[PDB]
């Protein structure tokens, strides 16, 4: 079909740009002092993210901060290098845009555009659950995002509402590329968030891009049910439900939605949607998605069901409060060798 084809072309042309950047990455585009540090927007793995303000242009950004030494003790050097290298080469509407990246004696810094609407996570917990139509508008942008990433041979491997921000127009922006990796072929690292881990993973069998599609499965359920499919208090109990191959859907889920889900939440890779002949196409054409005008989604033409409230530039209202911590820079360089190409 004509519609595909157009996709294929766009995608081809997109691969061309990314390679260009993938092969000749940006480095040292700024310095710490060019920004006023305002407030911690959230935390994560071994880093923190802060609202910052660009002294020279007046813009606000979100700056992610990694302690070199910490990354080293936690064996995350390759992941960190990968994160930055991938983030700087990508370009897609639903991905956060990296502005600058730089380093110093003790840290690694990534400056991205500020997405003020907050984590999907918080709206989600507050609201309880999203309506099938609301959930679909979100899922759709994730489907197109993964279609993009996967085409570039990238595996994103940490989908979760805590990593999806809502912008000014109600659209999503995926963040946290810390486990993103470019591989042709199989991978084996043990990483992700327990509730979202594909079975092959927990089973450490070696895996591919299909883990992303299982994740999208979890995400969709969570969104619509207001709780993940496999929940417990201790990770291990969680791992046992994921492998057991048993899901129970709520009574309010449409039949189309459970159909999609039982396909996505498929234990057998051979049978999992996204990892077969028609690829992503089996998802885009699913019945649940009959109403989605994928191109208009792409173009941000659809009306967002919910638009967060943004009161002023630098408004942090849509994010929780965190203990601020001092940023310390040694008058001594930490692990230069390890982070040379950063």
């Amino acid at each position: 079909g004509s519609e595909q084809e157009s996709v294929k072309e766009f995608l081809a042309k997109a691969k061309e740009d990314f390679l260009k950047k993938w092969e000749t990455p940006s480095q040292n585009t700024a310095q710490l002092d060019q920004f006023d540090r305002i407030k911690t927007l959230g935390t994560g793995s071994f880093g923190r993210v802060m609202l910052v303000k660009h002294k020279e242009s007046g813009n606000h950004y979100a700056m992610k901060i990694l302690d070199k030494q910490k990354v080293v003790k936690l064996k995350q050097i390759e992941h960190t290098l990968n994160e930055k290298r991938i983030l700087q080469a990508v370009n897609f509407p639903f991905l956060v845009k990296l502005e600058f990246s730089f380093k110093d004696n003790s840290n690694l810094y990534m400056v991205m555009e500020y997405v003020a609407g907050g984590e999907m996570f918080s709206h989600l917990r507050r609201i309880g659950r999203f309506s099938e139509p609301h959930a679909r508008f979100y899922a759709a942008q994730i489907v197109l995002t993964f279609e993009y990433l996967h085409s570039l041979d990238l595996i994103y491997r940490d989908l979760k509402p805590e990593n999806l921000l809502i912008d000014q127009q109600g659209y999503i922006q995926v963040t946290d590329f810390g486990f993103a990796k470019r591989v042709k072929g199989r991978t084996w690292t043990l990483c992700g968030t327990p509730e979202y881990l594909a079975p092959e993973i927990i089973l450490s069998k070696g895996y591919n891009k299909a883990v992303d599609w299982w994740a999208l499965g979890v995400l969709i359920y969570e969104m619509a049910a207001g709780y993940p499919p496999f929940f417990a208090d201790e990770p291990i109990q969680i791992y046992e439900k994921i492998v057991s191959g048993k899901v129970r859907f709520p009574s309010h889920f449409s039949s189309d939605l459970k159909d999609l889900l039982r396909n996505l939440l498929q234990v057998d890779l051979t049978k999992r949607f996204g990892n077969l002949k028609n690829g992503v196409n089996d998802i885009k054409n699913h019945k649940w998605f009959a109403t989605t005008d994928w191109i208009a989604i792409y173009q941000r033409k659809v009306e967002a069901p919910f638009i967060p409230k943004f009161k002023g530039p630098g408004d942090t209202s849509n994010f929780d409060d965190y203990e601020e911590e001092e940023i310390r820079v040694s008058i001594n360089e930490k692990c230069g060798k390890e982070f040379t190409e950063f």
């Binding site: 959230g42 994560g44 793995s45 936690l74 064996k75 995350q76 992941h79 996570f121 917990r125 309880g128 940490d158 979760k160 805590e162 946290d176 810390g178 486990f179 690292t189 043990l190 990483c191 992700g192 968030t193 327990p194 509730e195 207001g226 709780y227 929940f231 417990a232 208090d233 990770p235 129970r248 709520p250």
Partner: peptide
């Protein structure tokens, strides 16, 4: 309800990413 079991569980807050 399952929802109620969710709310009383110890994993309703932000979940961190694991590694090894």
């Amino acid at each position: 309800t399952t929802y109620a079991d969710f709310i009383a569980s110890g994993r309703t807050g932000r979940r961190a990413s694991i590694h090894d």
